[PDB]
Each structure stands twice: as C-alpha cells, then as structure tokens.
Amino acid sequence: TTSAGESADPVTTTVENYGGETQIQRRQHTDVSFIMDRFVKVTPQNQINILDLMQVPSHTLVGALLRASTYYFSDLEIAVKHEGDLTWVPNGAPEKALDNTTNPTAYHKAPLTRLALPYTAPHRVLATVYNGECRTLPTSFNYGAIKATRVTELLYRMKRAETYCPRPLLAIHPTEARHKQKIVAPVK
Amino acid sequence: TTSAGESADPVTTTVENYGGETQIQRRQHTDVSFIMDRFVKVTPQNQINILDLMQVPSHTLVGALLRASTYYFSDLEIAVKHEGDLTWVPNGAPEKALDNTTNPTAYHKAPLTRLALPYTAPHRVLATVYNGECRTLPTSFNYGAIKATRVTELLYRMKRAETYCPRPLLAIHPTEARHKQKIVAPVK
Amino acid sequence: FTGPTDAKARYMVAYAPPGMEPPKTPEAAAHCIHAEWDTGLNSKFTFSIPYLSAADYTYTASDVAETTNVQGWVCLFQITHGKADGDALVVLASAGKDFELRLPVDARAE
Amino acid sequence: DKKTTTLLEDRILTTRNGHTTSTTQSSVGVTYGYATAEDFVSGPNTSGLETRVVQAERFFKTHLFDWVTSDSFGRCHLLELPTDHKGVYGSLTDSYAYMRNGWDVEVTAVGNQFNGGCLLVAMVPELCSIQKRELYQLTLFPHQFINPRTNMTAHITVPFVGVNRYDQYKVHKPWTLVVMVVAPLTVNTEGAPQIKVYANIAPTNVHVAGEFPSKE
Amino acid sequence: DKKTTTLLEDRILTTRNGHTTSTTQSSVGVTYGYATAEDFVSGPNTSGLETRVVQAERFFKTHLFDWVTSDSFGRCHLLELPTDHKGVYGSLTDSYAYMRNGWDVEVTAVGNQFNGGCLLVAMVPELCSIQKRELYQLTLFPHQFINPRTNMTAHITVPFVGVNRYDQYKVHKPWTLVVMVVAPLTVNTEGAPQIKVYANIAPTNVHVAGEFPSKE
Amino acid sequence: SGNTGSIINNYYMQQYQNSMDTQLGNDWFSKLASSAFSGLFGALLA
Amino acid sequence: SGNTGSIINNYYMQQYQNSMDTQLGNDWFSKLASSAFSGLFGALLA
C-alpha cells in the first residue's frame, strides 16, 4: 500500500495484498520479562563490588537488550563464588557498613551463594543513560554493594524486568555481503 | 488359510484353524515410547559435542531401533560427566555461543549433570536417512551442542519418542544352524 | 521517494526464491512475486517479503559453508524515471504481523 | 482528472493479477473494451477437455519505444499479442494445441508534468497494418490517452475475440496493442528530455486444450 | 487371485489420472502405503502462496529393466522420484522453488502364464542404497508382488512424505521405486523368453510455491 | 507414557519440562495389523 | 511471568521474595503496533 511517508504512523502491510495468508505467531521468546530473566557473568573486583547492571558487557544478550531501553526497573538475583562470608548492603549505605555482619551476610557454603535482592534505589526507575554531564551515571543508580575476602565470580539476573523508551540495538557490521559464522552441525 | 499372495494385504492365521486357542498378549515392552525411553552411552569428543542421535551405535538397542524408523520426533535428556561447567546451545546456534554462559550452563556438581532439553530443530520431524547426496545428513538434523573443559561420558535418552515408516532391523547372521551364546545361569 | 515535485519514477520490488540465480532485469523478475509502483502525492510504498521455505523455520545466522543465500534475494529495480536523476529513494524495514523469533542465544565474543 | 496537487486521490489505483500488483497514483480509470466479461469458455470445439491455468494470469513486461521530440503525429508502435513469453504463459503455448485468454494491459509513459504532447493507446483486433488516414479513427477501438499534464498510465482490459472459440497462437494473433503519437512531445525548460514507454500486461482467463507430446 | 480362465473378473481395474487411463485384466488390487490421503498441504512454510496444478496429474512412462533368466535373487533396479520429466510436471520443477506430490505407480512385467519366478515391487522413502541382508525385509515398505501364474501388474499409491512439508526436488528425492527379483525367471518350454519391466507413473496432488524468474 | 513411573505431579510446568506440540488445520500400523484377514478362504469340512 | 516454571507455591511470602510496588493517584508500544495501518490507500482492481 502507498501512504504518506512523512508521518510516523506505522504501516504494516501483509502478504494478503498479493494473495498470501498471514500465519499465527508465538512471541513468548521476545517477551521482555522472559528474555532478561537469566544469569549473565560480569568480571568482579577482588573484594568490594558495587551492584550495577551497567557492568554487564554491552555485547552480551542481557547487556545489549538492557541498553536498548532508556529507563528500567527490576528486582535482582546474584550468584557469587567467594572466599569467606559475603555481606550485602542496600543502596545509600556507607561503604564501611560492608564490614558489619548484621547487614545481610551469607556464610560460606560450597560451591557458591545465590541470593534474591529487592530493588533499593530512591528513584521510581533507573536509567541506562542520563544527560547530566554533557559516560557517568548518578551514584544513586545501583542495587547496593557486596564484599567478601575474595570474590572470584559474579553473575546478575534481572527479575520482573520492565523497560521504557527503546534505544538502538546493533548487530555486527560485516565486511562481506553477509556476516557468516560456523553454525553447530553433525560432524564430518 | 490360502490367499492371493501377490497382494500386500496382511494375513494373520491363528491356532484355532486346527483346534487350538489364541491366548492373551501383553505388549507393553514393545511400545515405542517405552522402549526408546532409557539412556544409551556414546563415545564423546573432548570438548564440543554436537547432540546427534545418529552417534548412538547401530548395534545397541536404542541405536538399532532408532534406525528401524525413517522419521522420528522426541524431546531429550542427557547425562554428562564433565570437568568445568557445561554449556548447551540450541539447534542453529553459531559454535562460538558455546563459550557464553548466559546460554544454559550447568555449574559442575559431582558426579555428573543430568538435563532435560526440548526438541529445537526447524523441521516438523527428523530422519535417520535422507536421500539428498546420492552417509551425510543435513546440518540442521541435531538437538543443539554442548561444551565443557573436558567431557568424559555422555548418555542420551529419548523422551516422548514417535517413529514413522519402519525400516529393516537385523539380528546377527550366524555361521552355525543357531546363534548360541552363554546365557546367565546359577553357578556349577 | 524524496525527489522534488517535478521528478517522477516507477519502481519494482521482487522476491527471488533460492534455487536459481536472481534476475538481472525487470523482464526476468516479472515472473517472480513482485509489485510495481510510481511516485505521486503519497511518498511511501510498503511491501511484504513472504516467508517461503522447505522447513517451518529458517536460521537467523548465515553459515560459512553456504555460498548462495539459502533464503533467496530481494531485487529492487527502476522501471523508468522522468527527470529523477540523482534523486534518493530511502528504504526501511520492519517486522510483519506474523514475524516471529525463537530460541534465545548469546553468540557474540565482542 | 476528477479527483483533487501532485498525482492523487481517487486517482490511486492498484491492480492485482495473481501474485503480482501494480499501483499508479495518476490513474484515469480503466477502459473495458467490447464487453465486461468473457463469452462461453466451454463449447463443442473442445469436447469438455479444456482447463483453466490460473498460474499464467499475472503481469509480464516489455519496453515498447522511446517517445522523442522528433516523432510526429501518426508515429506508431505495434505489439502483436501474444508475444514472446519466457514464463508460465509461454510454456503453455508449447504444451497445448488450443488456447484462449483476454488481456489486462497497462501502458506507462513516465516523463513529468512539464512535458506536453499526447499519446493514444489502443487495443485493436486483427491488425497487421494500418493506413495513415485510418489513424484518425483509431478511437473506434478500446483506448485511453496519456497526456503528461494529467497522467502517466493508460489501462485497458479486453476479452478474447475471434472467429474461433479457441485459437492456435502459433498461426494467429487476435489482438495488437498500438501506441500512437497524437501531439508531439514538448520538453520546454523543465520537462523530461524524452519518455520511455513500457507495457505491463497480464493474460486473463487462460484456458488450454489438446495436450501435445513432449519432444523426448 | 480371488476372482474366477485367462486374466479376468473383478481383476479388471481401470485407473484414470487426468486425461490418461490404464486398464489391466489381471489386477491383484492396489496397495496404499502409509496413508490413504495426504496430510495438510497448506502450512506456515508457504504463507498461503501455494497452488495446485492439476494439469501435471497424469501418467508418464519409463522402461525399468529386462528381467532375464540369469538374474538371481536380490537383483534390483532402483528409480529415484521425481525422475526426468519432459512434460508439464517437469516444467513445474524449473518454474517453482518448492513442490510436493504423492505418486500413483503401476509396474508391469508382461511375459505369459507359463513363465515362473517372482518380482517384488516396493516404494521406499529416502533410499539411496540398500545392503543384501536388508532385502529380506523389503516387505516392510509399501509393496506388491508380480508372479506370472497370477498377474502382470503391480499398483502402489503413496502420499508425499518428508521432514519438510514442501520439498526442493533438485536436491532431495523422497521416494525410490524398487523392483527386486525374489525367485529367478523360468521359461520352460512355453514361457516368454524374457520379460521387459515398465513403469506407468502419475504424480498426485501436485502443489507448487515460490515462482522463479525466467532465464530471459 | 514412556518409561516414567512417579505418581506425584511434576514440580515444573509442562511448558518447561517438554517442548509444546502445535496442530495444523493416526496409527497406520495398528490399523494395518487389525485389518489382517484371519479367516479361511474356501469351504470348511468337519 | 518471566523465566519461572515451578507449579508449587513459593515457600516464602511475597513481601520477602520481591520488593512490593506502590501506586500513585499502559503498554505504549503494544498500542502503537496494533494501531498500524494494514489496508490499501486507493481503489483495488481484480
């Protein structure tokens, strides 16, 4: 169909235009809450680690999709491999609090510690970008912090995720006509 | 009874023809879904292993019965002994994905990892033989792939199996009048 | 279309399925599924590329072994134009009503 | 035009033939020639053995000629139909001895609205050649004009015609598409320098009978 | 045979596919393999763009092999389907990217009733090659026997099968017709000296999708 | 169905335990075996 | 909701398992996609 292209009103033609038939679609895998709900690894600091989803690398599935939203909300689960006991403090806590074990402290139990944590920021939602300094995000954009004698692995998992105002999501720029890769296949 | 042998119409006479009596039969053990539903061992590759049921040896119970069907469908369970963490990627994934742990990754837990996996091929059913190259089966005939630092044992188990279009199923060709073997028996 | 009021043109989009080389001319491409349109008051034309394949799903990634594209080609031709030399035809893409993605995978190394 | 700035309004027409469509924003309507439907397709000459082949009913394309300022009144381009066809419709002519179909014809002459001049497009039955004086009466045949200040597309739809209910296209061509220059092309300062004329044609209600042997 | 002197009674069967018919007076019936009807022909992989082409549903013929007294048990002749076709069905494979159809197959081995021996005719899916021991189980596939004392014609009808709902026949052949010698041909004093084996095959429920460009 | 024998409900939803089948728009060998001729083709004596 | 698939009730109260939402005093993109024009803008022939 033709239309006024200057308008942002979406136009979605279908194959029925030339005699085809539109099929049924099942889009559960592109549901935001479902797709963000899985663990992703970040490289940890030795002891004190601020819980900040922007640490998730931008090329990962979770990191790229998170960056494709401007504002977001979620609760969180973390899985941590650590020596010693692990202490968590909420958003707004003095860093010294990390040495006091009345703050949620999980005693070491092999092979790792998994915890469910609530959102604790003072804002109604957080943002992946913030036009203040025109990089740096306000200090209040975090889910608290953790500390152990040694933290060797740290995974984040967004729960009940909500996203607002989509932003660019980019695939790899290929050099040839098509980006080609080795796909899994039965052997020789 | 006599009949026209040229026709493929089945003829199933019974002992009643000469005064006998047909008995009751209980055929639960030859039910396809039941018989295929058990683990079978395959020899694994050190790290990357494509999940392909054609790797099951043809003389095993599962391997022979699978090959006695042309097309089949099933979900799958695998049991794996591995060092390090085990990652699985679905059918169609670039092989590099096996190094990213947001794809289903089971952290090492002695003595082995057992997982239930869904069928993920793009076809309505898979085939044990495919007359394209007239050996080689299309690359899309697989259940994904797994990878760990070292995979030392791998077992497959077909779930909810369905089979279509039976094919030859052969016993051992004996040299003597009867194939004889040592059967388990109370000792001397 | 973004040319001035006095620039006119007629275009053709065709979908060529795998199995034969893609058409090099509008005449050969006419035998494929296709649409032709011209310029006028409405500056935009939208066309649905149909999903046609042997299997029910196709891969989003492209394998290093597949020399020719397994899902065919999109061919855009200019049938003719009237004083539209140098004018630009801007092109965009969106998901159709039954477009569906399945089987999440995290495949990038960077 | 009877519609409403640039090429518009109820002057936007989309034609669909099979899995092919054609849209124009400067339509002047469709001329139906001689009838608005085919006559009987099943008569005694095919003994109930004819069949319809819907896969052939779709658009195919050809260039006709380039309209230039030096062409004067009466300059014509003739295209006998059926013409060479390398798709499904063409293969039917090598597979069946008898056939019939009508035609859905679109002719375009895209220049701009600053060109002047005028083309007459007509569908004429049984036409091998025509004299100069007869051109003054070409409007007796199904036609439409292409006048740059108004439109760039002509559309004519005609049924199968002939002394016989089915034809042998290898030896007889019932229709000829003719495009004639009525008033010479003018370019002035802002018009397109020349106008290429193209045809977008679809066979309609295609029926065949009398299957041939293969060459094998 | 279950009927009644020479080849007869309810052993007379006439099969019609399109404008082609085949009659045999020594029928032993028809074997339907795997199903008595096709599964769905319109699924999501063709987006409602598939069409049926009834003009291709008719018999075509090929010689298979000559059965001679020196052939022994296990001697086979394999014919992958679709095979080369120089008529309408064959042109469809050059005009559309995707297709599906079943097969109505008649195999004849005309000698006389004084010949002895026996042929097994079977339709086997996805078969490039087979081992000698597997031949003992060829009856697992849709089949019929040709035994000179009883019949000269075998008839098997099968639907389209495959991992995909539509196929790309240039790269995959879903069915293979196999004729195998079960008991060697005997001639004795009055039998025919050898028996030529021929196939009369018709594609059934032919659907196509994805029109190709022409070579033009 | 299959080689499964727990009497209590699976802890995980079906949507997670197995892939889900869909329908568009049937045991051939069972019908074929059931259709077998089991009589006697001519006359029976004694 | 999300990637969760247990059929049995969580052992912990909701008040502990997650933060609790509050209200003061809505899927924009779903409405936007649903509102898309899917017709044909002029006259249709054949």
CB-based contact (8 Å) between A34 and chain G?
yes
Q: How many CB atoms lie within 10 A of CB C4?
A: 9
> Nearest 5°: CA angle at E51, between E47 and E57?
145
Domain CATH number, residue D110: 2.60.120.20
* Closest CB from B10, B37, B118 relative to F18: B118
Q: Are the C-beta atoms of B89 and B112 separated by less than 8 Å? A: no
Q: Which two tokens stand for residue F2?
A: 């299959």
B165 — alpha (psi -120 to 50), left (phi > 0) or beta? Answer: left
CA-based nearest residue to E57, from E189, E208, E204: E204
Check if C43 contacts B (Cβ < 8 Å). Answer: no
In Å, what is the CA distance from B99 to each residue of A60, A66, B87, B88, B104? 12, 21, 7, 10, 11
Give the ranges where A56-179 is alpha helix by DSSP (H): 61-67
C56 and B102 within 8 Å at the Cβ level: the answer is no
Asked if B48 and B137 touch (Cβ cutoff 8 Å), the reply is: no
Would you list the domain boundaries of chain F? 1-46
In Å, how far from its chain's centre is CA D171? 20
Do residue A20 and residue E44 have CB atoms under 8 angstroms apart? no
The CA-atom distances, in angstroms, between E120 and each of E70, E155, E180 are 17, 11, 5
CB atoms near residue E159 (< 10 Å) = 18
Between CA A142 and CA G21 the distance in angstroms is 18
For residue D62, report the phi and psi dihedrals to the nearest 5 degrees: -150, 155
Quick check: C31 and E214 CB within 8 A?
yes
Q: Name the residue facing G38 among A13, A118, A119 (closest C-beta).
A: A13
Please name the amino acid found at residue F15.
Q
The helix or strand, by DSSP H or E, that contains position G29, with its residue range, turns out to be helix G28-34
φ/ψ of D115, rounded to 5, equals: -85, 160
**Which ranges of chain B does DSSP label H, i.e. alpha helix?**
32-36, 61-67
Measured distance CA(G17)–CA(G4) in Å, rounded: 13
What gap in Å lies between CA B3 and CA F37, rounded to an integer? 9
Q: Phi, psi (5° rounding) for residue D55?
A: -65, -15
Q: Testing the interface with E: which of C13, C24, C48, C53 to mutate, by most E Cβ within 10 A?
A: C53
Q: Are B147 and B49 in contact (CB under 8 A)?
A: yes
CA distance E139 to E145: 10
Nearest to E142, CA basis, from B165, B109, B104: B165
Dihedrals phi, psi of A16, to nearest 5 degrees: -60, -25
**Nearest-angstrom CA–CA distance, B47 and D182:** 79
* Half-sphere exposure for E210 (CA within 13 Å, toward CB): 27
Find, among A54, A53, A56, the residue nearest to A75 by Cα. A53
For residue B93, what is the nearest residue in chain C, using CA coordinates?
Answer: C105
Residue D67 parent element (H or E) = strand D60-67
Nearest CA in chain A to C46: A1
Q: How far is CA A96 from CA A92, A142, D117, G10, in A?
A: 12, 17, 89, 34
CB contact under 8 A, D87 and E55: no
Query: Which chains does chain D touch, 3 or more C-beta pairs < 8 A?
Result: A, C, E, G
Distance CA E29, CA E119 (A): 16
C83: left (phi over 0), alpha (psi -120 to 50) or beta: left
Report d(CA D50, CA D207) in Å as an integer: 6
Technique behind the model: X-ray
Structure tokens at B40: 């079978």
Listed residue (E153, E156, E151, E152) closest to E139, CA to CA: E156
Q: Which of C8, C11, C79 to substitute to test the interface with D, most D CBs within 10 Å?
A: C8
Distance CA E24, CA E6 (A): 12
- Collapsing DSSP to helix, strand or coil, C72 comes out as coil
How big is the B-F interface in CB pairs under 8 Å?
49
- According to DSSP, the residues that pair with E124 across neighbouring strands are E176
Q: Is E213 on the interface with A (CB under 8 A)?
A: no
Helix (H) or strand (E) holding E49: none
- How far apart CA B77 and CA B83 sit, in angstroms, is 19
Please list, in sequence order, all residues whose beta carbon lies within 8 angstroms of the beta carbon of residue B38, skipping any fewer than 6 positions away.
B61, B62, B157, F3
Chains within contact range of chain E (3+ C-beta pairs < 8 Å): A, B, C, D, F
Alpha-carbon span A44 to A39, nearest angstrom:
15
List residues of A whose CB lies inside 8 A of any D CB: 1-2, 17-20
E strands, chain B, where?
Answer: 40-42, 49-50, 69-83, 86-89, 105-106, 113-117, 126-127, 145-147, 150-166
* F13 close contact with B: CB closer than 8 A: no
F24 → closest Cβ in E2, E35, E40: E40
Q: What is the CATH number of domain G1-46?
A: 4.10.90.10
The DSSP line for D120-178 is: EEEEEET-S---TGGGGGGGGSSEEEE-TTT-SEEEEEE----SSSSB-TTT---EEEE
Give the closest-approach CA distance of G1 to chain A in angstroms: 7
Helix or strand holding residue A114 (H, E): strand A113-117
Rounded Cα distance, D1 and D150, in Å: 7
Contact at 8 Å (CB) between D185 and D116?
Answer: yes
Q: For chains A and E, tell me whether 3 or more CB atom pairs sit within 8 A of each other.
A: yes
3-state secondary structure of D92: helix
Q: Do chains D and B touch (3 or more CB pairs under 8 A)?
A: no
Distance CA B47, CA C29 (A): 48
G6 strand-pairing partners? F12
- Contact of B43 with B152, CB cutoff 8 Å: no
Q: How far is CA E187 from its chain centroid?
A: 26
Contact between C104 and A31 (Cβ < 8 Å)? no
Distance CA C8, CA G14 (A): 64
For chain D, helix (H) and strand (E) counts, in that order, are 1, 12
Q: Which two tokens stand for residue B148?
A: 């760990």
Tokens representing residue G41 in the block: 């803008």
Residue D172 structure tokens: 């007889």
Whether D200 has its CB under 8 Å from any CB of chain G: the answer is: no
Residue in the structure block whose two tokens are 């010949």: E115
Amino acid at D53: V
Using alpha carbons only, give the angle D154, D155, D157 rounded to the nearest 5 degrees: 150
Task: Give the burial class of F34: count Cβ atoms within 10 A of its Cβ; 0-12 exposed, 13-18 middle, 19 or more buried.
Answer: exposed
Q: CA C77, CA C36: separation in Å to the nearest integer?
A: 9
Its sign, for the CA torsion A36, A38, A44, A49, is positive
Distance of CA F42 to the CA centre of its chain: 35
Cis before E82? omega within 30 = yes
Q: Going by C-beta distance under 8 Å and a sequence separation of 6 or more, which residues neighbour residue C69? A: A178, C18, C62
Chains D and E touch (3+ CB pairs under 8 A): yes
Residue B106 identity (one-letter amino acid): A
Q: Is C36 helix (H, G, I), strand (E, B) or coil?
A: strand
Under 8 Å between Cβ of A169 and A68: yes
| Concatenated DSSP letters of chain F | --S----SPPSB-HHHHSPPP------HHHHHHHT-B-S-SS----
Q: From CA D164, how far away is CA D123, in angstroms rounded? A: 19
Task: Name residue, tokens 């200057």.
Answer: A6
Contact (Cβ atoms closer than 8 angstroms) between residue A45 and residue A52: no
Domain hosting E192: range is: 1-216
Picking from E45, E49, E99 by the largest number of C CB atoms within 10 A of its own CB, the best residue to mutate is: E45
Domain total in chain E? 1
At CA B111, angle to CA B109 and CA B117, rounded to 5?
70
Q: Does E37 touch chain F (CB under 8 A)?
A: no
The structure tokens listed for G24 are 């003061």
Provide the token pair at F13: 């939803």
- CATH architecture for the domain at B1-188: Sandwich (2.60)
Which residue, among D17, D77, D63, has the nearest Cα to D199 in the 3D structure?
A: D63
Determine the residue of chain G that is closest to D17 in CA distance.
G46
- How far are the Cα atoms of A67, B148, B155, C106, E159 from residue B85, in angstroms, in the given order? 28, 6, 17, 16, 47
Apex CA B167: angle with CA E30 and CA B79, to 5°? 145
The CA distance from E193 to E187, in Å, is 6
For residue B188, give how far its alpha carbon lies from the nearest alpha carbon of chain F (Å).
36
Helix (H) / strand (E) containing B29: none
Taking the CA atoms of residue B2, residue B7, residue B8 and residue B14 in that order, the dihedral angle to the nearest 10 degrees is: -10
Report the C-alpha gap between C50 and C53 in whole angstroms.
10
